[PDB]
Ligand binder design. Structure first.
Ligand SMILES: CCCCCCCC/C=C\CCCCCCCC(=O)OC[C@H](O)CO
Length: 492
């Protein structure tokens, strides 16, 4: 009943089981079953056989939860049908090389099924595997099972140690469950249930203190403009008319107005009179505007540097082309925004890794453009104690009518819970919502519409343990399990 081909096919099923645990489905027990399969199917196999089981397990997970990038390739790349499919398969195969490396190293150094393998060696080795997947070649740390516990019992662990710590606990509990199920021993099962029920009383603790006196009315415009690679005439006039006519009635009623990523589809240097006239009108009616735009700035080398920029206008933030109250994108998308090859004979420019928060009407907002919100370590480093709200703008017009924007929206909720700060997410047509300090959704408008999300938000001024330390304590605990497990395997 173990021809390994059965384990290869079962790894495909247990791998795709994890996709059913994210935002479009919200079934967090699917993560435990997905990890138990990867933990169990790697028992008593060759280092190369276990590596193939891990590679096949990762191929089923990424083949189901990442395939939504095909339409993104079927829109920007222009390649034929079969070529776009091969690029998605090669992406899923590359992302599966890390999970196969995890099961390969776990079997080469721990061939036997011991409680140290599944509860000590597996979680420690899993943190190093997922790190390399989300760091190598400007990594893609997508589909992390810690993002599923945003609404579950283990939510109280994120503000203490981070989302990557929940990934450490899920592998430890599922390892004990897979061990207790094969050996038919009730002892690891009880330890697993205990270690899983312990983090529950942590969700009823609030490291933040809301300030109802500083409650303000915020508005976020959802433009829902059609996508066209060609910059035509009139498209800018129609886009500017749509965003203004939805913003003009808000002035004098909402203090903070937010436009999504690259709302002004023109260069910043070309819309100087449009921004000057809009800044002066906002200052008169007592309001501010935070909008995304593309900035083509001249370097002192007399060269042009293109940035994916966030600019501020209005009261408390007078607009100026040389103002430092802006935000430039740091970590860029590998293919869509730059070219990985340095010399081959259109590329954007990266911003600073740490940028000061945006100030509008005295409100501090640490910005993160689109993909940057899923990087919990970088967001915490940019985070500051005086930050009132977390700001995230994105253009999820790509991969529409898919599970992509939901997985992206779910990872953004974790940043609010990690830092105990409200999240302001404004999109062109994606998931425009307001997330509370505990990851709770306070407001949300539907997708694919041209509406305006207007609600009231209250700032907090807490300091979670993760905000002070970050993933730094997790690597300490990871090194302790790693050194103890390797020394135990080398204790021969
Ligand atoms: C012992 C470690 C000290 C580190 C220096 C503390 C500087 C910030 C001080 C207070 C704000 C505490 C919360 C601020 C959280 C974001 C700032 C931060 O983490 O600084 C990064 C660190 O300096 C390198 O990565």
């Amino acid at each position: 009943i173990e021809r390994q081909r059965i384990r290869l096919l079962l790894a495909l099923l247990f791998g795709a089981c994890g996709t059913l645990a994210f935002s479009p489905y919200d079934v967090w027990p699917a993560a435990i079953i997905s990890l138990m399969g990867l933990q169990a199917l790697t028992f008593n196999r060759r280092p190369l056989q276990s590596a193939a089981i891990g590679f096949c397990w990762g191929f089923g997970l990424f083949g189901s939860g990442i395939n939504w990038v095909y339409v993104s390739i079927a829109t920007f790349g222009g390649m034929p049908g079969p070529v776009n499919i091969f690029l998605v398969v090669l992406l899923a195969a590359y992302l599966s090389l890390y999970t196969g490396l995890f099961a390969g190293v776990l079997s080469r150094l721990w061939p036997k099924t011991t409680w140290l393998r599944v509860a000590i060696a597996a979680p420690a080795l899993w943190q190093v595997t997922e790190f390399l997947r989300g760091w190598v070649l400007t990594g893609f740390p997508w589909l992390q099972f810690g993002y599923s516990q945003i609404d579950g019992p283990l939510k109280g662990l994120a503000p203490i140690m981070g989302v990557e710590a929940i990934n450490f606990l899920l592998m430890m509990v599922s390892g004990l469950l897979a061990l207790a199920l094969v050996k038919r021993n009730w002892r690891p099962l009880v330890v697993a249930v205990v270690l899983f029920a312990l983090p529950f009383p942590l969700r009823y603790i609030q490291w933040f203190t809301p300030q109802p006196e500083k409650t303000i009315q915020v508005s976020m415009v959802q433009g829902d403009i059609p996508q066209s690679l060609k910059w035509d005439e009139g498209q800018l006039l129609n886009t500017l008319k749509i965003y203004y006519n939805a913003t003009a009635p808000l002035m004098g009623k909402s203090s903070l107005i937010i436009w999504p990523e690259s709302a002004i589809t023109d260069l910043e240097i070309n819309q100087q009179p449009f921004l000057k006239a809009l800044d002066g009108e906002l200052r008169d009616k007592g309001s501010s505007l935070v909008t995304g735009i593309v900035d083509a700035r001249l370097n002192k080398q007399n060269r042009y540097d293109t940035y994916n920029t966030i600019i501020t206008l209005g009261k408390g933030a007078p607009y100026s082309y040389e103002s430092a109250d802006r935000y430039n994108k740091n970590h860029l998308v590998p293919f869509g925004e730059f070219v990985p090859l340095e010399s081959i004979l259109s590329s954007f420019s990266r911003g600073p890794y740490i940028q000061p928060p945006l100030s509008a009407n005295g409100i501090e907002l640490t910005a993160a453009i689109c993909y940057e919100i899923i990087l919990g370590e970088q967001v915490r480093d940019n985070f500051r104690p005086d930050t009132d709200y977390l700001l995230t703008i994105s253009n999820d017009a790509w991969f529409g009518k898919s599970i992509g924007p939901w997985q992206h929206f779910q990872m953004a909720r974790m940043r609010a819970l990690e830092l105990a700060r409200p999240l302001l997410r404004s999109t062109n047509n994606g998931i425009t919502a307001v997330i509370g300090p505990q990851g709770e959704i306070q407001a949300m408008i539907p997708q694919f519409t041209r509406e305006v999300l207007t609600t009231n938000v209250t700032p907090t001024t807490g300091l979670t343990p993760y905000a002070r330390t970050g993933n730094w304590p997790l690597w300490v605990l990871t090194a302790l399990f790693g050194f103890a497990a390797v020394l135990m395997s080398l204790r021969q």
